[PDB]
Amino acid sequence: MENFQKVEKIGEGTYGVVYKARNKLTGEVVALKKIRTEGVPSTAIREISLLKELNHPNIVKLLDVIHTENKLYLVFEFLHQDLKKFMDASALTGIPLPLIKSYLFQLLQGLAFCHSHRVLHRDLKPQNLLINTEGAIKLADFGVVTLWYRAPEILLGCKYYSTAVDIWSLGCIFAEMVTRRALFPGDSEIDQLFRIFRTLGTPDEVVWPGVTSMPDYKPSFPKWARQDFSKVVPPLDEDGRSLLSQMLHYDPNKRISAKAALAHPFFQDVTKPVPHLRL
Numbered sequence: 170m171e172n173f174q175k176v177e178k179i180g181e182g183t184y185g186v187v188y189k190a191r192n193k194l195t196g197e198v199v200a201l202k203k204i205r206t207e208g209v210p211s212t213a214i215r216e217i218s219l220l221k222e223l224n225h226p227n228i229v230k231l232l233d234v235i236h237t238e239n240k241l242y243l244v245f246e247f248l249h250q251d252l253k254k255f256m257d258a259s260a261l262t263g264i265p266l267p268l269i270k271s272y273l274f275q276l277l278q279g280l281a282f283c284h285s286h287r288v289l290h291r292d293l294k295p296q297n298l299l300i301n302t303e304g305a306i307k308l309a310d311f312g313v314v315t316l317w318y319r320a321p322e323i324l325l326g327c328k329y330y331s332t333a334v335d336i337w338s339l340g341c342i343f344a345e346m347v348t349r350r351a352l353f354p355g356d357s358e359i360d361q362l363f364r365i366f367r368t369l370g371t372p373d374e375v376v377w378p379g380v381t382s383m384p385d386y387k388p389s390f391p392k393w394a395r396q397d398f399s400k401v402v403p404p405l406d407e408d409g410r411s412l413l414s415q416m417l418h419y420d421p422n423k424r425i426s427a428k429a430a431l432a433h434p435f436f437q438d439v440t441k442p443v444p445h446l447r448l
């Protein structure tokens with residue numbers, strides 16, 4: 170409130186409001202996240218302080234953690250646009266495929282890094298994915314909410330998330346970049362789940378061992394069949410469709426890791442193009 174000249178609200182995330190701000194001494198422009206409650210517990214400050222060492226060029230740098238008074242502010246490197254806006258700005262033509270590829274490759278590297286340190290994101294979405302004028306894309310935030318990108322194990326009530334929930338969300342985002350429609354626009358938990366079911370078929374014990382004994386699994390679920398995958402993401406080529414489907418496996422254990430996804434044939438001719446951004 171003292172050290173930081175608020176320039177503008179850029180929105181609210183799940184655990185607080187985010188401002189573009191200017192550091193009053195250093196002149197640095199930064200993303201200021203105010204966190205909002207019973208005094209700011211011991212646990213959270215420690216966990217958050219771990220994230221100051223989670224540094225990768227595809228992860229939005231956490232610059233500073235300020236616990237002052239009762240209050241907690243997170244200070245981040247500011248990026249100029251999010252992918253949501255950039256997709257809206259690209260609706261008429263679609264993001265060029267080489268750019269889509271580059272972005273996916275980069276995010277998978279950010280995930281591979283975070284995952285090898287046992288940190289998950291758990292709410293990856295187009296509003297969380299941040300781009301600059303140099304052709305880079307970064308993951309933001311590791312601590313009405315949208316369900317479009319929730320993994321089916323989360324919706325089916327598994328308490329113990331794995332790295333595979335991020336692979337799932339990334340898969341949904343990939344598809345969305347490619348088709349310019351959201352893959353699974355659920356407006357509630359069951360709507361989300363049944364939209365997943367309609368496209369990939371109701372999962373069973375064959376494709377997902379252990380599924381029928383999950384907390385919110387119901388034997389009364391409608392049993393839809395898998396839709397053809399070339400129907401789902403035209404005009405994604407065969408390499409991309411193949412990679413997509415390994416990212417969208419029901420069973421989190423069969424779901425491709427970030428690291429293996431980086432080795433997929435889809436990325437053989439990957440490049441880093443520079444987009445046109447209107448700021």
Ligand SMILES: CCN(CC)C(=O)c1ccc(Nc2nc(OCC3CCCCC3)c3[nH]cnc3n2)cc1
Nearest residue numbers: 180181182187200245246247248249250251254296
């Ligand atoms: C359509 C106009 N907008 C505003 C919607 C933009 O395109 C836009 C958006 C964001 C940035 N920059 C930005 N945003 C963050 O967080 C944003 C929150 C993430 C969690 C969910 C809610 C939003 C950041 N965190 C760390 N560095 C950040 N940099 C620049 C321009």
